[PDB]
Design a protein around this ligand. Structure first.
Ligand code: NA
Ligand code: NA
Ligand code: NA
Ligand code: NA
Ligand code: NA
Ligand code: NA
Ligand code: NA
Ligand code: NA
Ligand code: NA
Ligand code: NA
Ligand code: NA
Length: 196
């Protein structure tokens, strides 16, 4: 397998992605109170929205890049989900496919007792990775309900990142101490291991 550090990236992305699902990521996404965050010239639109249900939450394969000085990792956490908008004037259940990436920077740091840990630094959604598309068959939608997509663009990334970033932090603190130690030693000495 040499060089065995080649495997660390995959192990890290496995443990993190596993941690996310073990920690209830999908249900957490499903239970965001989107229509209430949005409620509490839009009053018409908003008044014609019976409810919103979030279904088919998805975690995609994680991306990982190591910084050029070797001290930091950047994890790309790609998410998908479907918004089910009950809006009767529309004639049908309105479905929106959502995509969003969260970027989490991972750092190594030693504690007051000398123990080394992986910790979350910056954590925030990736500019321009939010995608909201109305599911209408093989024919795309143009200029229908742009206001709804606009409000969603304003609220949805922030809700999602406010749920996902704390979850990532907790997972980091609970990782396998052996994996933590090996990766953190690499990071703290600025040593490259993630293959681009
Ligand atoms: Na090896
Ligand atoms: Na690796
Ligand atoms: Na390597
Ligand atoms: Na894998
Ligand atoms: Na749901
Ligand atoms: Na599902
Ligand atoms: Na750098
Ligand atoms: Na309606
Ligand atoms: Na639809
Ligand atoms: Na951001
Ligand atoms: Na995207």
């Amino acid at each position: 397998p040499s060089n065995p550090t080649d495997l660390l990236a995959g192990k890290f992305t496995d443990a993190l992605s596993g941690g996310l699902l073990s920690g209830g990521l999908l249900g957490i996404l499903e239970n965001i109170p989107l229509l209430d965050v949005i409620k509490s010239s839009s009053v018409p639109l908003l008044n014609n929205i019976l409810d919103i249900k979030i279904t088919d939450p998805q975690l995609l394969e994680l991306g990982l890049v190591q910084s050029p000085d070797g001290h930091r990792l950047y994890v790309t956490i790609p998410l998908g989900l479907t918004l089910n908008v009950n809006m009767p004037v529309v004639g049908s259940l309105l479905q929106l496919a959502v995509k969003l990436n969260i970027t989490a920077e991972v750092l190594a740091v030693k504690d007051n007792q000398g123990r080394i840990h992986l910790v979350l630094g910056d954590c925030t959604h990736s500019p321009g990775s939010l995608k909201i598309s109305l599911l209408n068959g093989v024919t795309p939608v143009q200029s229908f309900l742009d206001n709804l997509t606009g409000i969603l663009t304003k609220v949805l990334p922030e809700l999602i990142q406010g749920k996902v970033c704390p979850l990532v932090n907790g997972i980091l603190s609970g990782l396998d101490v052996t994996l933590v130690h090996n990766i953190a030693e690499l990071l703290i000495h600025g040593l490259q291991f993630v293959i681009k």
